[PDB]
Amino acid sequence: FMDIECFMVLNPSQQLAIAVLSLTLGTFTVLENLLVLCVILHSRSLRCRPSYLFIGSLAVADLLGSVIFVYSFIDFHVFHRKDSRNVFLFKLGGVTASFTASVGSLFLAAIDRYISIHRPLAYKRIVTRPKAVVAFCLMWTIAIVIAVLPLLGWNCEKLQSVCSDIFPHIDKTYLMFWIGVVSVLLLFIVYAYMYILWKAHSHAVAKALIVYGSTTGNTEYTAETIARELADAGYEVDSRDAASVEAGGLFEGFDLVLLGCSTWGDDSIELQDDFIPLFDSLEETGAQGRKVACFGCGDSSWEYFCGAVDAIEEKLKNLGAEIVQDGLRIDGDPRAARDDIVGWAHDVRGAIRMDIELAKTLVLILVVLIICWGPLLAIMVYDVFGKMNKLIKTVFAFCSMLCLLNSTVNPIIYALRSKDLRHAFRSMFPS
Ligand SMILES: Cc1cc2nc3c(=O)[nH]c(=O)nc-3n(C[C@H](O)[C@H](O)[C@H](O)COP(=O)(O)O)c2cc1C
Numbered sequence: 001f002m003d004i005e006c007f008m009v010l011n012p013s014q015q016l017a018i019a020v021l022s023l024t025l026g027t028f029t030v031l032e033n034l035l036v037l038c039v040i041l042h043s044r045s046l047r048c049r050p051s052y053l054f055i056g057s058l059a060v061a062d063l064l065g066s067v068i069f070v071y072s073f074i075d076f077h078v079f080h081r082k083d084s085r086n087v088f089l090f091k092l093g094g095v096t097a098s099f100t101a102s103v104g105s106l107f108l109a110a111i112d113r114y115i116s117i118h119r120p121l122a123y124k125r126i127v128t129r130p131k132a133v134v135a136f137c138l139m140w141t142i143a144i145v146i147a148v149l150p151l152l153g154w155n156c157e158k159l160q161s162v163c164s165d166i167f168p169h170i171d172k173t174y175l176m177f178w179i180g181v182v183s184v185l186l187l188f189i190v191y192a193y194m195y196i197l198w199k200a201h202s203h204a205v206a207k208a209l210i211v212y213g214s215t216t217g218n219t220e221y222t223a224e225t226i227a228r229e230l231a232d233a234g235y236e237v238d239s240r241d242a243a244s245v246e247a248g249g250l251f252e253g254f255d256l257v258l259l260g261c262s263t264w265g266d267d268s269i270e271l272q273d274d275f276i277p278l279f280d281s282l283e284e285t286g287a288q289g290r291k292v293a294c295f296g297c298g299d300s301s302w303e304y305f306c307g308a309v310d311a312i313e314e315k316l317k318n319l320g321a322e323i324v325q326d327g328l329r330i331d332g333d334p335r336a337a338r339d340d341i342v343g344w345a346h347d348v349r350g351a352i353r354m355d356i357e358l359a360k361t362l363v364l365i366l367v368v369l370i371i372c373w374g375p376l377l378a379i380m381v382y383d384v385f386g387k388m389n390k391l392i393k394t395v396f397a398f399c400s401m402l403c404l405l406n407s408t409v410n411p412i413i414y415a416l417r418s419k420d421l422r423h424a425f426r427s428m429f430p431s
């Protein structure tokens, strides 16, 4: 047991500074989530299809969290209210339940969006309306139950233990548990949105595989400017001489595969020597319905014009084909056929990044979270292991406003971005 006055670290200037932040951020949170709660109700009186579970839950948790926290905080730090062990822990249970319910609502919103990116086909089977409804109802009950623990025994005074140097009458073990659960589901939100951000960057650039087998380098000079036009169009190009390749699924993870081989053999129709081991090894390779386009050098003087392109086009059509366009068939010098090679390169590219505005919003979320939870929960971790000075206490007071800004910025992130809610609000005006 300690004294109420030890937890009131603010001076007449620090108190005014705080009251400003508490009542500005607080009033805007109260009013913002109210308008969101109003428009959700109006929307469900016209069109029933939109959910509003992860938008409404957060609107409740924020508004409630705000009224209780803003009022409690100011009454303790400005009015200097000295309340009973169970009376304090009751007002405290008000912020713990509400702020947990808030972060848990951002958690289920993130598990929804993670399932939609990871398994989009299985998402409609697993993420369903009746499963989702239960999820918020059990989110809320568990959150309340965590906040009810200090009032019915799990406190520093009843359980003769080490008291919190930031939270009056709270047991250090209750704190470690709450930081535990809060951190647990807070870190998942961070991972889920990192996964979604990763998955989107892999698709931003189309990966291209240009393999060529050339003798006098005439198909090399072709492939060099086939790869040039593609790299120019934002392609993750990787040109490989058929003399230095691996038949072990060479084409795996490639959007567009290009096989450039030169037509050789004097008496008969023959492939390039480099492309010869790669041709037989097409089975061991993937090409399992891959977008494959063919090219190659030959001569109009020769009986079988670019037959090597044909033999490949035939062997690919038997397997997964998906032949984007009819094979490019240049003569002895592609030097003047420059226009034809780039011309075919354009239309073969012509037959086939990442939604940055949505991806920006996911980056903002993490930025906001790291700023509003990181420092706050860091001072909470300090108290857990040992003591803390007057400075650490006063810094925590201004770190408390951090998550009040989070309560304010939330409607602007999720609700305001909802096309469904945006139209539902516009509805309320005359025609
Ligand atoms: C011995 C020999 C045989 C050839 N046979 C053919 C052929 O059957 N069909 C064809 O279209 N071109 C044929 N050509 C022409 C080649 O395709 C031409 O040299 C080509 O531009 C070489 O390209 P590369 O440097 O990529 O091998 C032949 C050329 C040589 C030297």
Ligand SMILES: CC(C)CCC[C@@H](C)[C@H]1CC[C@H]2[C@@H]3CC=C4C[C@@H](O)CC[C@]4(C)[C@H]3CC[C@]12C
Binding pocket: 052, 053, 054, 056, 057, 060, 064, 093, 094, 095, 097, 098, 136, 137, 140, 141, 144
């Ligand atoms: C005072 C605070 C800390 C305790 C919360 C108690 C009350 C107000 C809670 C407990 C049960 C809660 C409900 C549980 C489930 C949901 C589903 C969600 O999609 C929207 C909010 C909604 C409908 C909650 C609204 C607020 C609620 C009625």
Ligand SMILES: CCCCCCC(C)(C)c1ccc([C@@H]2C[C@H](O)CC[C@H]2CCCO)c(O)c1
Binding pocket: 007, 069, 072, 073, 076, 088, 091, 092, 093, 094, 095, 096, 099, 166, 167, 168, 174, 175, 178, 179, 396, 397, 400, 403
């Ligand atoms: C395990 C308990 C978690 C508490 C949530 C942390 C939170 C950021 C919400 C918080 C809660 C309480 C305070 C103030 C700590 C002061 O020491 C005493 C007055 C509290 C506000 C009154 C709550 O009813 C806080 O700054 C941050």
